[PDB]
Design an enzyme around this catalytic site. Structure first.
Site, PDB file in Angstrom:
ATOM      1  CB  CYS A   1      -1.097  -0.028   1.246  1.00 12.48           C
ATOM      2  SG  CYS A   1      -0.293  -0.626   2.731  1.00 12.48           S
TER       3      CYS A   1
ATOM      4  CG  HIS B   1       0.615   2.494   7.835  1.00  8.26           C
ATOM      5  ND1 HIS B   1      -0.194   1.404   7.983  1.00  8.26           N
ATOM      6  CD2 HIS B   1       0.913   2.031   6.329  1.00  8.26           C
ATOM      7  CE1 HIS B   1      -0.675   0.603   6.833  1.00  8.26           C
ATOM      8  NE2 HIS B   1       0.167   1.130   5.786  1.00  8.26           N
TER       9      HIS B   1
HETATM   10  N1  LIG Z   1      -4.186  -4.191   5.379  1.00  5.71           N
HETATM   11  C1  LIG Z   1      -3.394  -3.534   4.570  1.00  5.71           C
HETATM   12  O1  LIG Z   1      -3.360  -2.306   4.768  1.00  5.71           O
HETATM   13  C2  LIG Z   1      -2.657  -4.073   3.544  1.00  5.71           C
HETATM   14  C3  LIG Z   1      -2.628  -3.111   2.163  1.00  5.71           C
HETATM   15  C4  LIG Z   1      -1.650  -3.748   1.265  1.00  5.71           C
HETATM   16  C5  LIG Z   1      -1.179  -5.003   1.238  1.00  5.71           C
HETATM   17  N2  LIG Z   1      -1.579  -5.634   2.442  1.00  5.71           N
HETATM   18  C6  LIG Z   1      -0.886  -7.081   2.404  1.00  5.71           C
HETATM   19  O2  LIG Z   1      -1.743  -8.199   2.153  1.00  5.71           O
HETATM   20  C7  LIG Z   1      -1.764  -9.256   2.855  1.00  5.71           C
HETATM   21  C8  LIG Z   1      -2.769  -9.659   3.826  1.00  5.71           C
HETATM   22  O3  LIG Z   1      -3.112  -8.395   4.603  1.00  5.71           O
HETATM   23  P1  LIG Z   1      -4.473  -8.273   5.631  1.00  5.71           P
HETATM   24  O4  LIG Z   1      -4.392  -6.806   6.208  1.00  5.71           O
HETATM   25  O5  LIG Z   1      -5.691  -8.599   4.537  1.00  5.71           O
HETATM   26  O6  LIG Z   1      -4.194  -9.203   6.749  1.00  5.71           O
HETATM   27  P2  LIG Z   1      -5.391 -10.319   7.383  1.00  5.71           P
HETATM   28  O7  LIG Z   1      -4.660 -11.054   8.545  1.00  5.71           O
HETATM   29  O8  LIG Z   1      -6.674  -9.519   7.629  1.00  5.71           O
HETATM   30  O9  LIG Z   1      -6.072 -11.426   6.215  1.00  5.71           O
HETATM   31  C9  LIG Z   1      -5.175 -12.693   6.028  1.00  5.71           C
HETATM   32  C10 LIG Z   1      -6.246 -13.655   5.704  1.00  5.71           C
HETATM   33  O10 LIG Z   1      -5.568 -14.893   5.239  1.00  5.71           O
HETATM   34  C11 LIG Z   1      -5.863 -15.825   6.019  1.00  5.71           C
HETATM   35  N3  LIG Z   1      -4.637 -16.844   5.929  1.00  5.71           N
HETATM   36  C12 LIG Z   1      -3.592 -16.737   6.482  1.00  5.71           C
HETATM   37  N4  LIG Z   1      -2.815 -17.852   6.053  1.00  5.71           N
HETATM   38  C13 LIG Z   1      -3.576 -18.671   5.008  1.00  5.71           C
HETATM   39  C14 LIG Z   1      -3.342 -20.011   4.617  1.00  5.71           C
HETATM   40  N5  LIG Z   1      -2.029 -20.529   4.702  1.00  5.71           N
HETATM   41  N6  LIG Z   1      -4.548 -20.345   3.639  1.00  5.71           N
HETATM   42  C15 LIG Z   1      -5.453 -19.808   3.492  1.00  5.71           C
HETATM   43  N7  LIG Z   1      -5.753 -18.486   4.261  1.00  5.71           N
HETATM   44  C16 LIG Z   1      -4.751 -17.914   5.387  1.00  5.71           C
HETATM   45  C17 LIG Z   1      -6.290 -15.117   7.465  1.00  5.71           C
HETATM   46  O11 LIG Z   1      -7.145 -16.151   8.114  1.00  5.71           O
HETATM   47  C18 LIG Z   1      -6.875 -14.075   6.921  1.00  5.71           C
HETATM   48  O12 LIG Z   1      -8.300 -14.274   6.717  1.00  5.71           O
HETATM   49  C19 LIG Z   1      -0.439  -9.100   3.662  1.00  5.71           C
HETATM   50  O13 LIG Z   1       0.618  -9.478   3.088  1.00  5.71           O
HETATM   51  C20 LIG Z   1      -0.307  -7.494   3.634  1.00  5.71           C
HETATM   52  O14 LIG Z   1       1.045  -6.934   4.131  1.00  5.71           O
HETATM   53  C21 LIG Z   1      -2.184  -5.463   3.500  1.00  5.71           C
END
Ligand SMILES: NC(=O)c1ccc[n+]([C@@H]2O[C@H](COP(=O)([O-])OP(=O)(O)OC[C@H]3O[C@@H](n4cnc5c(N)ncnc54)[C@H](O)[C@@H]3O)[C@@H](O)[C@H]2O)c1
Ligand SMILES: NC(=O)c1ccc[n+]([C@@H]2O[C@H](COP(=O)([O-])OP(=O)(O)OC[C@H]3O[C@@H](n4cnc5c(N)ncnc54)[C@H](O)[C@@H]3O)[C@@H](O)[C@H]2O)c1
Ligand SMILES: NC(=O)c1ccc[n+]([C@@H]2O[C@H](COP(=O)([O-])OP(=O)(O)OC[C@H]3O[C@@H](n4cnc5c(N)ncnc54)[C@H](O)[C@@H]3O)[C@@H](O)[C@H]2O)c1
Ligand SMILES: NC(=O)c1ccc[n+]([C@@H]2O[C@H](COP(=O)([O-])OP(=O)(O)OC[C@H]3O[C@@H](n4cnc5c(N)ncnc54)[C@H](O)[C@@H]3O)[C@@H](O)[C@H]2O)c1
Ligand SMILES: [Mg+2]
Ligand SMILES: [Mg+2]
Ligand SMILES: [Mg+2]
Ligand SMILES: [Mg+2]
Lengths: 22, 338, 338, 338, 338, 22
Positions: free
Chosen positions: C155, C182
């Protein structure tokens, strides 16, 4: 000058008027 | 003899300052003898004792009656008049007023305390106009005992200026930009509401709130060689105390992160001891509650690009650390009282 | 024909992405047909509908049974296996996996989806190793349809890179430092608790929390001329969504704040329309919830010192704005599917 | 000699308990000799020292190496195995395990410590199944020295049960309803995420979150006459520690608020000294951080209607006050050891 | 024709009310023609559009000049005089003032609007002294068209009174206790600061803050049979909007939870439609932002003990739901105008 | 390598192991 600006001149410690430079 | 002190404005800074002095009272040349505030002694004694940030004061008993707050038998007379010209400073023999209301930061405003009979005023904020400004550890030895009104600058200037001085003397600061990611303060509204500043109008604990600030420009008052060479902004965030300065400087002498850290570490052990603390620990804001330094360098965050672009990050307890510096400046004025 | 999409990881990004697609479904070349997640369809349908940040989804009905989530009659098959090699991608005819777990960001990890039968993977995070990385509006037209694993960066990189590209083309960026103030994210602990990162261990809604970040270095992946010329850090603060980048650049061509703002404004009206938004309004973080831009320049905060040291500040909705870019990248891959 | 203690689960309760013991170590029959936890000792020494709620530990130095945490020269052996059957309790001569993981609250789970060589287990939570349950100040004198697995109940039960005992003995409780307005805990999610409880799934610092509580019915475990007569709920709110119980009782003997307060005050000075504190002060949750009582009656809030409908409100530090009670129970077991 | 309305006090309630009216303007008998407030129109147009809780106003453009706020081409005249006796109500032909400052809740205070030329005043708060009080859905049909000053009670009274009326008519309420776990409001302090209420003095986003509430006793104003039979308190917690009432009643007719829920559900579908909403969903406070009901019964939380002790829990959006009721009452007055 | 580090290798999605680059 608006009534609000005169209010802040007259009440600089009021919640609407505080400017802390931080 | 003791320098007799009155606090004008018994707010976050006024009460932090009072608690700082109560803890250092044995070695002090100051005696706090009066308070003026918009509220009454019983309310103010309650707030002095029960503090959401500092905890319950337990070093001594705090009581009150209609006329005084008592801090371990020591009586502090109280009055409540928003106009400083009406205050009983001659009647109480006040030598020094700690001007902590946020309202009387100009010479004309702070001089109302002199008219009421005080001999000197220390403003707990940037002064407006030509008010001599001091940062302890940077330029407080330039204080002139003939000055009747002085400023202790802002909390952010007190964090940034010691770091800038060390970096300037080692590498030569040509220009510098600052952002303070800063705890919210009482100038911001709790929920969206009327304010002369549209950003400070917004709900403080729900938002990141940018504000302009003179805190970086003000470093040039206490390091005159850098007048006009620094600028920056503030981002107020939903924590109630403790802030952090991010400073990016263009320097003359090429360097690397390791050298930047060693220069600040060396200063923290010698010429800046008690003012800058140097840390390699991976801590967070809560850990700096009650820290006595003006600046705590977070050494793990230091970085340099291309030799000449330096980033440093420094924590500060904006209420307590700044109030320790107010007390330090007042003790310095007392030691040099002519 | 439609590109058949599965979401791996139905978290903040997975669910924001799903809601982004549901709102843009009429003009889409993508059909979301499957979800894999550690939880079950009924729990996930509840979370998709009832979102503390986005509010209740009201564009269509959201229901679930043991096997599927239904979004307005449209059935999305659900499975729950933490090992991507076991997933039914061939059985479901999956073309593209949105890899949103945070776990499979290396080529070896993301390739487990290819082994399970998917044709391509889009990682919603920086890739580890040699994974082609794209920021829509900066370098997405360099996407090669033969690539099987791609990254949409972070992001913060999506906020910073468009601004950097505009500033570099106008003034020539020599070096640059970034700090993102952030919102906290789900990698941080709610109360102080076990974590491989001692800062992320600490209570997220009570602290300012520094973390290292590759987000500034990663701009050099999408603007190759600036490889090695950018660095920065993150400060996580107690807001649940919306973030702000503070970027300080050393530039070749001397400028002033007015010119910096006009250059970004011009780009926001032309080559960066939909990617950078330009604002002169005095807003705060809550006002940028749901904004579709990758970067919103806060023009009132721009400042320049000595011609060559430039500070700009840009907001971004780290959940929703980034998810709009994930969808944009996926639609681009679909339009160029060979 | 000393009862040798291991902590299983070095979390909020495990670490609060450790600090409680370190401060009461001079007069203790317990020696904390081991910790098992998800983390390694260096991470856990860091978290033991740097606590967002308790502040930096001051009373002794805390360090670590690969094998031990050191607290004031006292070496605590550390291991990291999430299956308690594998733990080195025989080799370390562990007498008593403090079971603070949250996941071994049944007899079959807690008994894994006995298989590994420990003699007894104290679960820092309500037990699942047929586990003897104690609230210090209510029924801990009924401790049977032959029991091998015991429960110290929940934080809310420890707050409510002493008040209920006093009210029942004075007025006769026929029925009672409770609501605890309770700080969030680590079982809740920082941002909306899957959870077995669809409300605990929701962003904890952004929401008022209703949840079940067995605390009312568990009062019937420690006051058997009241089995089946109480019920209630919890509302988790955005504070990180300190909670308050609101209890509305239907009583047999008609009374008034002044008499209810007199009865609880008398108990707090005699039979419940150190367990119930009686306060007439106008305080807020932050002021009760670190309070050692199980229950602090907020006497200004007591009200009675029609003689028989009694409302009382009591504060509790759910981390620290509860951990003081865990230590009290462990000391009681050590003094009645068989 | 239209009843011409002025808003006195353009705060949380004044601005929520304005947005409520803007969204219901097509079928209204009211025309909002004027605003008096501390702020100027440009500040107030900014705050009307940019709301941390409600989001950016979408339904029409909002702008301002020195004299007016403009909402979708509708010009609202603005003045800034804190003494209502000076207001231009005669010149502007104001029929009805919405008194939303919080400081003119007595007859002598509110009557200043009548001296200035208005015909009637609706106070958005409990009245001080002998002021007729209405809760829409409970007693608003008793409105006497000759009354010149009325009160719409408090937000908590509007949540509790409909539920109490239904329970009383079905089961006979003999006594009842309430606690509202309530979002903080602008009367509280962001950081510890003087206040007439020593608890409301304390940092609002950091604390659970008990405070008095007249809401229980005020239910006796709108349900006269229950005068003197109810009491309760508030616990202000760190959320910025949305609150929940916990009501424990002693009833005459013995009942069980299923029957209590059936009775409230039936009322919500008939006599209380639009006032009480009945929910069996497992939701949290954020999900009730913008709900139009006065009370949302959380049916999963209902419990009964011994036939006669009944606990019900009801949500309310204290800003928006209450402002919808202010608008409903104003429309009722406009339809029964004399 | 510590047991904790092996735990995060085996459970990279666990609360103790998440690293989001932000
Ligand atoms: N939240 C943000 O602002 C943001 C922005 C850009 C990128 N990201 C990136 O996106 C990714 C996810 O972030 P998020 O904020 O959605 O996190 P989150 O923890 O809310 O979501 C992760 C999801 O994946 C599931 N999960 C984890 N391991 C798994 C597996 N082995 N198989 C299936 N499902 C699995 C979890 O249960 C959860 O539902 C990260 O790499 C993060 O850095 C996040
Ligand atoms: N809070 C910080 O972190 C911090 C740090 C450094 C400097 N400062 C500066 O210190 C000053 C005070 O800040 P604060 O945070 O203590 O604010 P505050 O609002 O908590 O305290 C101000 C106090 O002054 C009183 N007051 C206001 N007007 C008055 C008058 N005319 N007469 C008497 N009393 C009056 C108020 O009632 C209040 O008790 C400001 O200038 C601020 O910028 C604050
Ligand atoms: N926090 C409170 O206010 C409170 C009060 C009273 C009781 N409790 C109870 O105390 C227990 C712990 O609660 P907490 O708030 O300290 O939770 P926590 O999550 O902070 O601590 C649990 C600790 O156990 C560790 N752990 C988890 N599974 C493990 C395993 N298999 N082996 C070894 N270590 C493991 C975790 O890493 C963590 O360090 C729970 O039963 C809870 O209900 C909590
Ligand atoms: N916020 C709630 O949840 C809620 C719910 C129901 C009722 N209320 C009641 O509504 C009233 C307003 O509450 P609020 O939360 O909107 O407060 P607020 O402080 O947000 O709004 C008050 C507004 O009135 C203005 N004002 C104050 N004194 C004035 C004067 N003399 N002349 C003109 N304007 C003046 C203020 O500047 C502010 O804009 C209070 O009586 C409150 O008890 C509030
Ligand atoms: Mg260079
Ligand atoms: Mg230059
Ligand atoms: Mg009775
Ligand atoms: Mg009965």
């Amino acid at each position: 000058k608006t009534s609000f600006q005169q209010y802040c001149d007259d009440n600089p410690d009021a919640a609407e008027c505080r400017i802390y430079d931080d | 003899s003791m320098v007799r002190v009155a606090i004008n404005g018994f707010g976050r800074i006024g009460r932090n300052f009072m608690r700082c002095w109560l803890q250092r009272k044995a070695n002090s040349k100051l005696e706090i003898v009066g308070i003026n505030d918009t509220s009454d002694p019983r309310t103010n004694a309650h707030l002095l004792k029960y503090d959401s940030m500092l905890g319950i004061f337990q070093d001594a008993e705090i009581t009150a009656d209609d006329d005084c707050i008592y801090a371990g038998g020591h009586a502090v007379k109280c009055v409540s008049d928003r106009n400083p010209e009406n205050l009983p400073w001659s009647a109480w023999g006040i030598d020094l007023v700690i001007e902590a209301t946020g309202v009387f930061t100009s010479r004309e405003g702070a001089s109302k305390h002199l008219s009421a009979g005080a001999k000197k005023v220390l403003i707990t904020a940037p002064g407006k106009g030509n008010i001599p400004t001091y940062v302890v550890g940077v330029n407080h030895h330039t204080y002139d005992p003939s000055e009747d009104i002085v400023s202790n600058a802002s909390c952010t200037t007190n964090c940034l200026a010691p770091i800038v001085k060390v970096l300037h003397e080692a590498f030569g600061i040509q220009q510098g930009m600052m952002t303070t990611t800063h705890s919210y303060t009482g100038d911001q509204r709790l929920l969206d509401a009327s304010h002369r500043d549209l950003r400070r109008a917004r709900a403080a604990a729900m938002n990141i709130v940018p504000t302009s600030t003179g805190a970086a420009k003000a470093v040039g008052l206490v390091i005159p060689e850098l007048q006009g060479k620094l600028n920056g902004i503030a981002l107020r965030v939903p924590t109630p105390n403790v802030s952090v300065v991010d400073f990016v400087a263009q320097v003359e002498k090429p360097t690397i992160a390791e050298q930047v850290n060693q220069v600040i570490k060396e200063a923290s052990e010698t010429t800046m001891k008690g003012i800058i603390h140097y840390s390699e620990l991976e801590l967070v804001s809560s850990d700096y509650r009650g820290h006595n330094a003006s600046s705590i360098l977070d050494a793990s965050l230091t970085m340099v690009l291309g030799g000449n672009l330096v980033k440093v990050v420094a924590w500060y307890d904006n209420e307590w650390g700044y109030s320790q510096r107010v007390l330090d400046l007042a003790e310095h004025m007392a030691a040099h009282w002519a």
